[PDB]
Amino acid sequence: PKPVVTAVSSTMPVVGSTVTITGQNFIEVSRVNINGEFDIPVGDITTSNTFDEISFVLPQAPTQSGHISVTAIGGTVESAEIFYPLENVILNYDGIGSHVWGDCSFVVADGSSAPYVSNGTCLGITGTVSASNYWWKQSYSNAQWVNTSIIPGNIPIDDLKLQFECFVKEVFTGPVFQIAMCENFDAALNGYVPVSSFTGKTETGKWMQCSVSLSSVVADATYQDFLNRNSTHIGVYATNPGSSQATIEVYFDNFRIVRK
Numbered sequence: 001p002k003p004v005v006t007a008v009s010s011t012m013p014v015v016g017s018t019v020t021i022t023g024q025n026f027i028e029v030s031r032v033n034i035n036g037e038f039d040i041p042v043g044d045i046t047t048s049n050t051f052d053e054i055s056f057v058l059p060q061a062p063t064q065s066g067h068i069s070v071t072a073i074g075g076t077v078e079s080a081e082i083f084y085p086l087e088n089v090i091l092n093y094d095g096i097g098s099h100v101w102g103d104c105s106f107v108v109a110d111g112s113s114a115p116y117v118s119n120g121t122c123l124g125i126t127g128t129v130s131a132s133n134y135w136w137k138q139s140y141s142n143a144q145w146v147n148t149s150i151i152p153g154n155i156p157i158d159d160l161k162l163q164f165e166c167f168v169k170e171v172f173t174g175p176v177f178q179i180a181m182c183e184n185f186d187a188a189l190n191g192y193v194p195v196s197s198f199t200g201k202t203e204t205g206k207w208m209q210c211s212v213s214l215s216s217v218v219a220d221a222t223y224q225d226f227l228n229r230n231s232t233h234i235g236v237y238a239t240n241p242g243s244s245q246a247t248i249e250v251y252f253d254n255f256r257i258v259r260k
């Protein structure tokens with residue numbers, strides 16, 4: 001019985017954070033290879049009772065994109081998603097894209113306070129916001145859109161998704177996020193609360209991958225049409241339409257556009 005991979009917790013997990021892989025027949029896992037660059041020590045791999053899940057801490061960043069390969073007693077299987085799709089990152093605040101203006105913070109995690117680990121600099125939206133507040137903290141940034149050598153111009157927007165890593169300290173009630181691109185606010189995603197692509201829940205106290213259809217923030221038919229808006233704007237805006245004051249602490253990194 002061959003091993004099978006059904007899902008991976010993130011395509012770009014933060015170094016020092018837990019990677020979880022779900023699937024079947026993870027029996028006597030003898031190797032987990034990351035992007036043909038390094039192996040996870042077998043002793044550092046945790047396997048569930050029913051052999052349907054493995055997890056491990058990512059010890060270092062791959063330098064190139066690739067896939068995860070899992071060897072079990074039944075054979076070897078490769079994850080279908082591209083792992084560490086570095087070429088798909090549009091904004092990381094460390095040389096891909098840049099912050100232009102906004103009330104927000106930028107942090108390099110220090111191992112002692114949230115978000116504890118980071119891949120370099122991340123965006124912070126943190127602090128206390130009054131009830132019914134429609135302009136609070138935000139970042140207006142310039143993205144570096146994915147090259148058409150990676151995503152051809154004729155790919156439908158319907159076939160693409162926006163992914164990013166997010167850390168939420170504690171759940172909150174009231175505050176929401178807007179994500180907008182190319183100053184097309186009519187097409188923006190509004191009222192968004194970060195939820196995990198892996199669990200469907202707002203995970204707290206750890207990084208999660210968040211994913212939305214690119215059509216939820218882009219109105220154009222194809223990727224080329226989107227590029228021809230001739231704007232590198234990407235904006236992340238926090239407000240609080242709730243009836244109570246709230247304090248939140250949310251971090252973002254590695255915005256990326258990938259194929260569904």
Ligand code: NA
Binds near residue numbers: 092119
């Ligand atoms: Na970063």
Ligand code: NA
Binds near residue numbers: 227231
């Ligand atoms: Na352009």
